[PDB]
Design a binder for this molecule. Structure first.
Ligand SMILES: *[C@@H]1O[C@H](CO)[C@@H](O[C@H]2O[C@H](CO)[C@@H](O)[C@H](O)[C@H]2NC(C)=O)[C@H](O)[C@H]1NC(C)=O
Ligand SMILES: *[C@@H]1O[C@H](CO)[C@@H](O)[C@H](O)[C@H]1NC(C)=O
Lengths: 189, 14, 180
């Protein structure tokens, strides 16, 4: 199918810094894939990014009253919607499920790859550390980055490539805002 | 909890 | 920055399909299901603590379709430029034999927001327990989508996520099976 498609995309964004201590509101009118019209709570009025929005901007900017009301959103819309459900978003907390296994077992005579697989934890923010005999493995570490599962949970994989010695005790340390004390799992020889 | 507010879309033909 | 809540909506002509949904820091909170005319929550729990009048959304969607047509003309009918997906197939949690799990077909960076997705267990389509998410917004005004296929890691089975988007010449298959 090749018949042309035309897309309209409207985005109303509420950006919060320090809880609700500093809120920002934006309205992005988008055509196909370019933003043409945009209201910034920090500017007060509408701005036309591309000539496509020109008319709109100048027509709304003349209504000083309405143009005012939109500034209010930071309260009527943003700060309001914030509390309407911080109970199940800002304060969501799902504990990480950590597991440490190494790719290829047989290979404990030469180069190997240890894998720390953190799964299903919520607050995106997390931090993993690889300890070779209680000693930060500051390098030679490869991470998957943060991965969004799309179901309000994340997963991530941090792997350690090392030459396994029958004594060395490598530990994976996971720090995440859902546990009082750090999460650690060990693996050696 | 409570109720969500949504900004309304207004159009202007020129 | 700390958080961002986005009321995101879109209308697509000629397909005449739109979408209204709230996004909190990347994940979906809820979205109005046009057809059923009712609002849908990503997590049951969310609903039990907040509400939204589906109708009011169906109202915007319509004024969007309008503004769209005006915005089409105003630009001498220049169509959207297809941007092909980028599919990856990961497993929800570490896959271990005979232990329940889920396959996630994660389609990213595309537009127009239109794409057919099929799960195939050993080249045959599967239509059960499968689940998808609506079209989630990106900062670049593209889309992201998710598909779910809960399975049972078997040594003898092989899965394929077939994705067909207009920006793709022929369908696309991401392959998965136990033991990389
Ligand atoms: C997604 O939905 C179907 C399955 O691919 C496609 O629609 C098909 O059905 C109709 C023909 O009877 C029309 O909608 C299309 O002509 C036909 N598909 C085509 C374009 O050949 C639809 O196109 C699919 N979307 C794509 C192409 O990714
Ligand atoms: C619209 O685009 C077409 C390109 O195919 C061009 O021929 C037509 O003149 C354009 N309209 C105007 C006059 O801007």
């Amino acid at each position: 199918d090749t018949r042309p498609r035309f897309l309209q995309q409207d985005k109303y964004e509420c950006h919060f810094f320090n809880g609700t201590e500093r809120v920002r509101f934006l309205h992005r009118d988008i055509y196909n894939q370019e933003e043409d019209l945009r209201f910034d709570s920090d500017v007060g009025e509408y701005r036309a990014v591309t000539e496509l929005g020109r008319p709109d901007a100048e027509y709304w900017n003349s209504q000083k009253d309405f143009l005012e009301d939109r500034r209010a959103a930071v309260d009527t819309y943003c700060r309001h919607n914030y509390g309407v459900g911080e109970s199940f978003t800002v304060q969501r907390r799902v504990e990480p499920k950590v597991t440490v296994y190494p790719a290829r077992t047989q290979t404990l005579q030469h180069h190997n790859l240890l894998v720390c697989s953190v799964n299903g934890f919520y607050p995106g923010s997390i931090e993993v550390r690889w300890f070779r005999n209680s000693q930060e493995e500051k390098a030679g570490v490869v991470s998957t980055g943060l991965i969004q599962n799309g179901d309000w949970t994340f997963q991530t994989l941090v792997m350690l490539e090392t030459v396994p010695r029958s004594g060395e005790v490598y530990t994976c340390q996971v720090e995440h805002p859902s546990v009082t004390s750090p999460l650690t799992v060990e693996w050696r020889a | 909890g409570g109720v969500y507010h949504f900004v309304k879309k207004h159009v202007h033909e020129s | 920055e700390e958080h961002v809540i986005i009321q995101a909506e879109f209308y697509l002509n000629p397909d005449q399909s739109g979408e209204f949904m709230f996004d909190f820091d990347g994940d979906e909170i809820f979205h109005v299901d046009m057809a059923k005319k009712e609002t849908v929550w990503r997590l049951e729990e969310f609903g039990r603590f907040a509400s939204f009048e589906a109708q009011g959304a169906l109202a915007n969607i319509a004024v969007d379709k309008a503004n769209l047509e005006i915005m089409t003309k105003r630009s001498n009918y220049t169509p959207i430029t297809n941007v092909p997906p980028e599919v990856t197939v990961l497993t929800n949690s570490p896959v271990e034999l005979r232990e329940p799990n889920v396959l996630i077909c994660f389609i990213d960076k595309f537009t127009p927001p239109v794409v057919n997705v099929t799960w195939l267990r050993n080249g045959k389509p599967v239509t059960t327990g499968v689940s998808e998410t609506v079209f989630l917004p990106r900062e670049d005004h593209l889309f992201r989508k998710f598909h779910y296929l809960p399975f049972l890691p078997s040594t003898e089975d092989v899965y394929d996520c077939r994705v067909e988007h207009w920006g793709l010449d022929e369908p696309l298959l991401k392959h998965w099976e136990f033991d990389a």
